[PDB]
Write a protein that binds this DNA or RNA. Structure first.
Ligand SMILES: [Mn+2]
Ligand SMILES: [Mn+2]
Ligand SMILES: [Zn+2]
Ligand SMILES: [Zn+2]
Ligand SMILES: [Zn+2]
Ligand SMILES: [Zn+2]
Lengths: 162, 162
DNA sequence: TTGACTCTCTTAAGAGAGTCA
DNA sequence: TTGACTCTCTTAAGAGAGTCA
């Protein structure tokens, strides 16, 4: 098994490589009518992506390193969390984009949490709009708002009460 | 079926059958430390379910009627909305449980909206905790709260900024 | 050891359609 | 005509593993 020192070395090489990705400045809603700025380190749209990186899906990548003749591979956003527990409350931990930008690999824009917690950030009002996430959101979720409901609750007769 | 009269007859037959489902009272968080009461009309756990109803999955049912000697079949929660547009902004419209209770078929607990709007209600603070849904929530979403994040954003070196 | 592709899978909110009696 | 089963699919947040040079 990889030692803690070897895992730390993997995280360090990953950080070195991701740190050289193009850094893109994005202005984002924070909630409460306020605007903030995030700096995303974005993996390229097409090969080559960077040393150790390869695309396994339209918005999916993996990181690969060969140690003592054994090939090791990880989901490209999971590497910052290799020294953390990988489940909680019986749920698998997932890499969760606080910036809601899939191509971004900035570890300051990622957290490690259940898929339900991950998804829910899409609708959060944001750090200046009432976010209650213990690990605070960096921005208002992209899907926050009144929604676009086509039809609401309704009945033709009198068979029901709310 | 095709005619508006035939569709109204389908909606009326569905309402009459679901109106005879057992009515189960559920006390629910509203947000803001307040509690409310919902009356769900719950499809039975096992056959028989009611005239026209059959189970296609653990928590999935369909409604079927024979019109003009042809069988017409719908997802069991879609029937109230048969006169509504079936898409919005190029996204499929879905039946969305305001009571977060799959077995419930009370149309006063259903709305018709994109899958994204639908999902997002799971994390809504609720009608007394800040819900901004234009078609208002009936309760706080079951997944609202601080979450259980295992690890937050972090870096080992000095290559990244927020 | 490395790059650039290939494939299928998970989850939890939702769907359509066929086989028998 | 009606009932009670069977199967796979959609979406958008996420995954693991194979092949070839
Ligand atoms: Mn996410
Ligand atoms: Mn729902
Ligand atoms: Zn980012
Ligand atoms: Zn938040
Ligand atoms: Zn209900
Ligand atoms: Zn709401």
């Amino acid at each position: 098994a990889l030692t803690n020192a070897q895992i730390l070395a993997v995280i360090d090489s990953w950080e070195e490589t991701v740190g050289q990705f193009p850094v893109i400045t994005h202005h984002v809603p924070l909630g409460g009518g306020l605007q903030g700025t995030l700096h995303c380190y974005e993996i390229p749209l097409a090969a080559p992506y960077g040393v150790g990186f390869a695309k396994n899906g339209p918005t999916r990548w993996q990181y690969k390193r060969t140690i003592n003749q054994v090939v090791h591979r990880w989901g490209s956003h999971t590497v910052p969390f290799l020294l953390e527990p990988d489940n909680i409350n019986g749920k698998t931990c997932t890499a969760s984009h606080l910036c809601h930008n899939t191509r971004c690999h900035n570890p300051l824009h990622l957290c490690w949490e259940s898929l339900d917690d991950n998804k829910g950030r899409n609708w959060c009002p944001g750090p200046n709009g009432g976010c209650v996430h213990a690990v605070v959101c960096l921005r208002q979720g992209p899907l926050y708002g009144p929604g676009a409901t086509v039809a609401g609750p309704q009945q033709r007769g009198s068979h029901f009460v709310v």
